[PDB]
Design a protein around this ligand. Structure first.
Ligand code: ADP
Ligand code: BEF
Ligand code: MG
Lengths: 406, 58, 765, 41
């Protein structure tokens, strides 16, 4: 290799890599803390009809709480709206609200997960002195979530950027060695694994070819007084991503598809309970069509929340930026939204395909028992890897200035 | 017809996206495969090390 | 950990005070030669701090009769250690400048002393010039009016008193020079910057820019201004009060397309007249006449935003000043284009050692440590202040506000104490002047057009019955000496008018009032419809302001507005802080590129043999040419070597000097060596054709013209990319990251254009 | 719309509170992404 060998010569980039990998070692030794005042081995002996530690909740409350805050920094709450319109001064106050709402939301969701655990285990995991043991479990999981936040802030401060995304990436790629030794104990021996590897590399290059794809709109400021070195096609534009929603609609469709099985499990055994379990099966086509249509509807919704044509057209009108032929007030909003109509259909069908990929992959491969290759974790791995490597390449291309004297 | 005209607009608009070319595509997939392979090896070594540490100290 | 160290060194200087008090005048003039011979022996500057400050502390008393305080010695040591020495506003911060500049001027290298404006530069320069030229050193002085010979004699002295704009413009006009002996400024050593919160905090945003001439266009401004003169104030254009940004409405766009006969205003064909409509609209309604400029003797002469003085040489950029001159029916001077650009941050990061002092710095100590690696030392006063900062009497309307200002100045004039009336703009100052005219008060206005009268007014404004109305010329650094019997009545009574954009700029007027332990009274009289509140006020307070009636004879007593005032000014100073932290990391790219291109241009200038460097430029150009015409992943049999020898015979050599049968199918580096052999033979033939004396001058003219022209063009393209780099965050990228990558890319294409064009012009003729 | 945004903001938080017991048979992680010059030279 050439690029990582150039990386391991620069002292700053090398120190950032050592710091990032050291904080991931800290993440793993925090992950390997069994029994936080909980059942000893009931999680191993009562799992099937699996990850449970101080990091069992993760930063998923931080993700969904920042989603709720991103929904509330609109015309719903005028206090959050004036925080968002009050410069870069009120964003810190909005992030403080995000932090405290995250703490209380994780404090609720850890108790909900504990109730689900001792309902699915029949309560035969540990005795309870009262509500204080569940409060202790909630304190432990909330402190673990805050410790993951502190590691993410350390990695986005002194490491290589995007520390929360690197923590999510490290939590994802730490289970694939267990997947590999389970599939090695499982093990057409080759000829089928070559087909699987070719399929995985084809899906990887499909995910690359969709995520690193921009539809750039030529923004021309009026401030060009003269020619004044006209290069031609100028390098200023508005790059719209093909799939602006990210991976959030997978989370929305999974949450809305597993919550009615949760309220069906709460009400006990019933005819409508068994019916809603069969119709929200997520493997049968009756539930799969519901999962796909929720993917498409919520990726249109969160794409319009993420790329917001009202605030985009207003910002282009205030800055002076226009599209050639398009007025800045409202024709710019209509033009951008009828471009985004056309882009997010492709983003919808791509993300629906990668969301329904693992069930077809397992059902037509049959060799791994529970290995989810596609889904959300593929997009997470691809995004974090590409963003970190672009960050390091930019940190070197800042350095390599040459001159003309020789 | 809304459906045919809309799909013609979609397939016409997909010709104006800055897609990656072949050398950037193979460089990106080499980056992704090398990163995921290095981290499988890295977390496997740390898994074996913490397993030995919890076997010894317990 | 440092304040007790400063006290220890101050007690050491006060201990050895008694040794230097009984010496002759020729002993202290010999003493600087003794210190310079001691520095020429192996002693550092830090080991001689105590003797140097004892000598200055005796010499300043010998000259002016005033004797330095131990607090001032603490400030002198804290300046010599290289970090910011905050002293309260009025405690003697020019004699604390007098102390370390002597010690750091003993080394032989120059010491610059920076200040905000030419009045403070002149005052400090004459007083400290008396002190230093009695003591032995030589003192320069730098102005806008001086020629380059007088500036070179000024910097050639040991100690230079100057402003910040002239240091930046001298640096930029020395990196635009043709000779090594024609440039002005010495290599930079040490800069005791005064009013650091003004220069490195308030004005760091704004860069100094030297621009060169351009061709003149005129037929757009007049037409655009003619068209804007006939627009309706809220139907046609929307003047945003907050960000001062103007846009035409859709009715205004229809009227523009109707008036100019065009089919679509927003297009690629009409970007020029779209720009002229935007700039004529900005010049009509965004900036007002006496608020933002001054019309003297047939030319628009702008006022500075921060010091309120009359910048008689500077011109607005992007064709705005021509739109102003077309608005007011003047003549349109020709438009210019940017030749060089620096910021004050990136300029004062080039000194070998910075040191500074101000009156208010603990607000910005964090940004000082994060940018300049300078920490703020807090220093006592040795006499407690008797100034009573009374709370601000917040009124309701502008008319009642100025009525109460006039009543306060009349009430304090009838008892016989001075009143200074702070302002921000200058038409507000003329308003207060003609308001105090028809009452019976002999006031004395201090405008942005009265600087000889600034000198006399500040001489005669601490007397028994003087009244001064000062816009910004007496709002920072200006001292007023109290006359006879005045401090028995209260001294200066600063009646401020507008709440400024910072607590620092607020507290500077309080510092005018109260100095050296003398009493003084300050009262801000601000409204609720001021420019500050009308721009950056909370919407709920502007809604709930209705409950106070209409009788504007008494100030508003409720605490809601007394919270909204501080909320609005903390909002505007947070917005300025965020705008600076956006400008810093976007100008670090051009900092890197500019230091590279200026260092290499200077080593082009002070070299005597440019033969190998011009040959290396030709080698790089030629290897890029053969690498562009001979691809490596493509088959080596099809290389279009006829096109290669056509490009070489057109650019470098003559017509029939190279063909395909000379070299064909060979390896490209040996082909490069053969064509460079032809280049070196032609170069030696030309060098013997008109002599090896004119050849180096000819190639130096070509190299310097190439560097200057392509650096001009690259500043313009870099600014055009910095305009729309923030739109890249709609793909969840990082705009700073993409800015750094694309800036490096066009910097490398700039260097390739430099090398190709200098190769073409050297081997052409 | 204004009713639509508050309806979605209620529904997402409510069903996330319901499905706090998550990952029954799968696994999901998620992610969130005026200047003037001086003349001459
Ligand atoms: N050591 C001293 N002894 C007596 N008077 C002094 C001494 N130092 C300063 N002063 C006087 O105190 C006043 C402080 O003014 P100045 O130094 O201009 O204030 P600032 O520190 O804001 O520049 C000056 O008039 C100066 O004459
Ligand atoms: F700090 Be002083 F009033 F210039
Ligand atoms: Mg001063």
């Amino acid at each position: 290799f050439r690029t990582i060998s150039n990386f391991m010569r620069v002292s700053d980039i090398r120190n950032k890599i050592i710091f990032t990998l050291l904080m991931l070692i800290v993440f793993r030794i925090g992950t390997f803390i069994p029994v936080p005042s909980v059942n000893t081995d009931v999680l191993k002996l009562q799992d099937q009809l699996q990850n449970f530690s101080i990091f069992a909740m993760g930063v998923m409350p931080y993700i969904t709480a920042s989603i709720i805050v991103q929904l509330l920094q609109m015309d719903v709450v005028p206090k959050f709206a004036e925080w968002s319109k009050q410069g870069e001064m009120g964003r810190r106050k909005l992030a403080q609200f995000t932090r405290y709402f995250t703490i209380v939301l994780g404090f609720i969701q850890a108790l909900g997960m504990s109730y689900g655990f001792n309902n699915l285990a029949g309560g035969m995991l540990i005795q309870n002195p009262g509500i204080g043991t569940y409060l202790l479990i909630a304190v432990v999981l909330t402190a673990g979530t805050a410790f993951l936040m502190w590691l993410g802030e350390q990695i986005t401060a002194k490491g290589v950027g995007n520390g929360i995304s690197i923590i999510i990436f490290a939590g994802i790629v730490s289970g694939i060695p267990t997947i590999l030794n389970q599939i090695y104990a499982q093990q057409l021996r080759i000829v089928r694994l070559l087909l699987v590897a070719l399929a995985v590399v084809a899906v990887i290059v499909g995910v690359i070819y969709i995520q690193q794809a921009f539809r750039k709109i030529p923004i021309q400021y009026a401030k060009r007084l003269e020619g004044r070195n006209p290069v031609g096609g100028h390098s200023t534009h508005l790059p719209l991503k093909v799939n602006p929603a990210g991976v959030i609609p997978v989370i929305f469709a999974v949450s809305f598809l597993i919550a009615p099985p949760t309220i069906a499990s709460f009400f006990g055994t019933n005819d409508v309970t068994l019916w809603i379990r069969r119709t929200f099966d997520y493997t049968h086509p009756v539930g799969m069509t519901i999962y796909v249509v929720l993917i498409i509807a919520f990726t249109y919704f969160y794409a319009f929340v993420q790329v917001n044509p009202e605030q985009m057209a207003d910002n282009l009108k205030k800055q002076g930026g226009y599209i050639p032929g398009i007025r800045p007030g409202k024709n710019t909003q209509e033009y951008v939204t009828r471009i985004l109509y056309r882009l997010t259909l492709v983003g919808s069908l791509f993300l629906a395909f990668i969301a329904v990929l693992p069930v077809f992959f397992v059902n037509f491969a049959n060799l791994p028992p529970s290995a989810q290759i596609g889904g959300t974790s593929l997009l997470i791995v691809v995004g974090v890897a590409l963003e970190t490597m672009k960050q390091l390449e930019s940190q070197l291309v800042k350095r390599h200035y040459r001159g003309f004297i020789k | 017809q809304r459906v045919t005209n809309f799909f013609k607009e979609v397939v016409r608009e997909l010709k104006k996206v800055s897609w990656p070319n072949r050398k950037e595509l193979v460089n990106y997939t080499a980056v992704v495969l090398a990163t995921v392979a290095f981290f499988t090896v890295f977390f496997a070594v740390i898994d074996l090390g913490i397993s030995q540490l919890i076997r010894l100290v317990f | 950990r440092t304040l007790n160290r400063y006290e220890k060194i101050a007690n050491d200087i006060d201990a050895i005070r008694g040794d230097y008090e009984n010496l002759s005048d020729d002993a202290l003039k010999h003493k600087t030669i003794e210190f310079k011979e001691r520095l020429e022996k192996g002693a550092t500057t830090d080991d001689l701090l105590v003797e140097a400050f004892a000598v200055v502390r005796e010499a300043s008393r010998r000259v002016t009769g005033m004797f330095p305080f131990k607090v001032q010695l603490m400030g002198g040591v804290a300046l010599h250690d290289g970090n910011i020495a905050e002293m309260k506003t009025g405690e003697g911060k020019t004699l604390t400048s007098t102390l370390p500049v002597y010690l750091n001027a003993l080394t032989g290298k120059g010491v610059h002393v920076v200040t905000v404006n030419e009045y403070l530069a002149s005052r400090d320069a004459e007083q400290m010039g008396k002190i230093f030229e009695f003591l032995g050193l030589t003192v320069g002085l730098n102005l806008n009016s001086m020629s380059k010979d007088e500036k070179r004699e000024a910097y050639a002295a040991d100690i230079t008193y100057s402003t910040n704009n002239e240091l930046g413009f001298d640096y930029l006009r020395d990196n635009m020079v043709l000779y090594k002996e024609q440039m002005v400024q010495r290599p930079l050593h040490f800069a005791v910057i005064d009013e650091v919160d003004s220069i490195l905090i308030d004005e760091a945003r704004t860069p100094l820019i030297i621009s060169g001439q351009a061709a003149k266009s005129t037929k757009l401004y007049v037409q655009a201004n003619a068209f804007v003169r006939t627009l309706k104030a809220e139907k046609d254009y929307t003047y945003d009060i907050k960000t001062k940004a103007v846009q035409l409405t859709e009715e205004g766009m229809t009227k523009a397309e109707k008036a100019f006969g065009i089919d679509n205003l927003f297009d690629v064909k009409h970007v020029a007249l779209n720009h002229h409509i935007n700039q004529a609209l900005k010049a009509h309604v965004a900036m007002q006449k006496d608020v933002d400029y001054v019309v003297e003797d047939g030319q628009v002469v702008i006022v500075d935003s921060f010091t309120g003085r009359l910048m008689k040489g500077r011109r607005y950029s992007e064709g705005l000043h021509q739109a102003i001159e077309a608005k007011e029916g003047l003549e349109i001077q020709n438009e210019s284009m940017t030749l060089a650009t620096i910021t004050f941050q990136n300029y004062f990061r080039m000194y070998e050692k910075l040191a500074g002092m101000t009156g208010t710095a603990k607000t910005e100590e964090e940004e000082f440590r994060n940018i300049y690696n300078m920490q703020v030392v807090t220093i006592p006063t040795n006499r407690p202040v008797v100034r009573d900062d009374r709370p601000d009497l917040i009124y309701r309307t502008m008319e009642g506000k100025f009525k109460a200002v006039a009543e306060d100045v009349a009430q304090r004039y009838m008892t016989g104490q001075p009143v200074l009336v702070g302002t921000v703009a200058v038409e507000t100052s003329e308003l207060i002047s003609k308001l105090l005219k028809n009452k019976g008060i002999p006031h004395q206005v201090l405008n942005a057009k009265n600087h000889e009268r600034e000198a006399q007014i500040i001489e005669e404004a601490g007397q028994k019955g003087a009244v001064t109305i000062a816009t910004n010329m007496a709002g920072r650094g200006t001292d007023i000496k109290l006359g006879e019997g005045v401090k028995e009545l209260g001294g200066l009574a600063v009646v401020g008018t507008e709440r400024h954009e910072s607590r620092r700029i607020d507290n500077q007027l309080r510092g005018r009032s109260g100095r050296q332990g003398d009493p003084g009274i300050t009262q801000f009289y601000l409204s609720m419809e001021d420019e500050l509140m009308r721009r950056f006020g909370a919407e709920r307070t502007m809604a709930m302001l209705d409950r106070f009636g209409m009788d504007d004879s008494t100030p508003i007593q409720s605490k809601m507005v007394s919270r909204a005032v501080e909320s609005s000014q903390k909002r505007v100073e947070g917005n300025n802080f965020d705008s600076r932290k956006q400008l810093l990391q976007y100008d670090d790219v051009l900092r890197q590129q500019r230091e590279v291109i200026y260092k290499q241009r200077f080593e082009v200038i002070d070299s005597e043999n440019l033969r190998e460097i011009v040959e290396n430029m030709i080698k790089s150009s030629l290897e890029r040419a053969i690498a562009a015409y001979t691809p490596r992943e493509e088959l080596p049999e099809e290389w279009k070597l006829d096109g290669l020898v056509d490009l070489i015979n057109t650019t470098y050599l003559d017509e029939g000097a190279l063909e395909k049968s000379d070299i064909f199918g060979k390896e490209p580096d040996e082909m490069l060596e053969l064509i460079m052999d032809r280049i070196i033979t032609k170069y030696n033939e030309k060098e013997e054709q008109f002599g090896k004396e004119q050849m180096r001058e000819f190639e130096k003219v070509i190299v310097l013209r190439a560097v200057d022209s392509k650096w001009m063009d690259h500043i313009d393209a870099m600014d055009q990319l910095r305009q729309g780099i923030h739109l890249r965050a709609y793909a969840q990228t990082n705009p700073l990251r993409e800015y750094q990558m694309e800036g490096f890319a066009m910097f490398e294409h700039m260097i390739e254009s430099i090398e190709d064009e200098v190769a073409k012009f050297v081997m052409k003729a | 719309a204004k009713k639509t945004a508050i309806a979605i903001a209620v529904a997402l938080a409510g069903f996330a509170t319901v499905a706090s017991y998550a990952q029954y048979e799968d696994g999901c992680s998620g992610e969130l992404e005026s200047g003037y010059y001086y003349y001459s030279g």
